[PDB]
Amino acid sequence: NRGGQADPTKSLQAAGSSSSGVAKGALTILGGQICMLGLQKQLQA
Amino acid sequence: LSDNPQRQSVSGPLSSTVYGFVNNSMMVQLPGQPGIKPLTFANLINFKVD
């Protein structure tokens, strides 16, 4: 009792261990958006 | 009807069947000091089958 690195790719490396793949979410939102715009256009058509 | 904290509710017109009523009615929490225990291992064991 007296003594004596900035790696954005790492954000996707956690997708396998305690899954944290954020670009997978980015893919999901991008696909959702493309679907929304396609449906809105074709419904207006 | 056993304790299933991961039972999904029936939505839309499928909620208008007696069987769907059963599935939905097992979820409503009576305020009698609920003892239904939410699970602790649901985020580490992962299952992405579609």
Topology diagram in text:
This is part of a larger assembly, with 2 copies of chain A.
Chain A: H1 10-13, H2 22-44
Task: Tell me what the structure shows.
The structure is cut from a larger assembly and holds 2 copies of chain A. Chain A is built from 2 helices and no strands. Helices cover 60% and strands 0% of the residues of chain A. The radius of gyration of chain A is 21 Å and the shape is rod-shaped. Chain A has helices spanning 10-13, 22-44. By secondary structure, chain A is mainly α. The chains hardly touch. Chain B: This is DotA. Chain B: It comes from Legionella pneumophila subsp. pneumophila (strain Philadelphia 1 / ATCC 33152 / DSM 7513).
List keywords for this structure.
2 chains; 60% helix; 0% strand; part of a larger assembly; mainly alpha; 45 residues; rod-shaped; protein transport
Could you write a compact summary of the structure shown?
It is classed as protein transport. The structure is cut from a larger assembly and holds two copies of chain A. Helices cover 60% and strands 0% of the residues of chain A.
